[PDB]
Amino acid sequence: MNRIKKVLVANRGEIAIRVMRACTELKIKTVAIYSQEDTGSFHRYKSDEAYLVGAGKKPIDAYLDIENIIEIAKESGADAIHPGYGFLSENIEFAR
Amino acid sequence: VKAELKEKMGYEPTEKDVISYILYPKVFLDYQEMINKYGDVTVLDTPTFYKGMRLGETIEVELEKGKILLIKLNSIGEPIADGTRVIYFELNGQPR
């Protein structure tokens, strides 16, 4: 693996995990993100690191806090971000 | 002595390490043995250093410029036969 050493998984649940599995299979470190209501979801324990994201936000709004996620991405050292499906998967502003 | 210490210590000592050893030999090794076990504790906030952590508490520790450990203590394990018990943490969101 070349220029991605670490990746952020900008999603939750099944899909989040599948990505983590892929990374680990490729010796890529992984970073998870969880909303307040998802402190329990076992996708957050499946990563190499994890941070809360949508602070004070309504539960669905929490995984869409674009700006927050980038700060988290930048503070983590994440070379790249995988948005999975749903949420910010198709959001242009984030992609840009 | 500088060689005595080097053999006593894991590696090659600095000039300062030496005088200290000469002045306080019993303690300097004891200090070394302790730093090997727990690492550079100088960094922990004082309350944590003397009082450890409360349950569900989260703290940050700066090991170096820009290198912060988010640490949360979730719960404490029950003792087993020989008194050992598992402590349950989240170092960087990742359960440990």
- Rounded to 10 degrees, what is the CA torsion of B64, A23, A90, B94? -50
- Using CA coordinates, name the residue in chain B closest to A30: B94
B95 to chain A: which residues are within 8 Å by CB?
A: 45
In the structure encoding, which two tokens stand for residue B71, read together?
């640490």
Task: Tell me, yes or no, if B93 comes closer than 8 A to chain A by beta carbon.
Answer: yes
CA distance B24 to B2: 14
Number of Cβ within a 10 Å radius of residue A47: 26
- Tell me how many degrees the CA angle B2-B6-B9 measures, rounded to the nearest 5: 130
Task: Tell me, yes or no, if B58 comes closer than 8 A to chain A by beta carbon.
Answer: no
Phi-psi region of A7 (alpha: psi -120 to 50; beta: other; left: phi over 0): beta
Q: What is the CATH number of the domain that holds B74?
A: 3.10.600.10
Q: What is the DSSP string of chain A?
A: --S-SEEEE---HHHHHHHHHHHHHTT-EEEEEE-GGGSS-TTTTTSSEEEE--TTS-TTGGGG-HHHHHHHHHHHT-SEEE--SSGGGS-HHHH-
Q: Which residues contact A33 (CB under 8 A, 6 or more apart)?
A: A8, A9, A10, A11, A12, A44, A50, A51, A52, A53, A63, A69, A72
CA distance B93 to chain A (A): 4
A51 to chain B: which residues are within 8 Å by CB?
A: 70, 93
For B72, the domain range is 53-96
Residue A58 identity (one-letter amino acid): K
- Using CA coordinates, name the residue in chain A closest to B70: A51
Among B65, B92, B96, the strongest candidate for a mutation testing the A interface, having the largest count of A CBs within 10 A, is B92
Which helix (H) or strand (E) element contains residue B76? Answer: strand B67-76
CA distance B65 to B96: 24
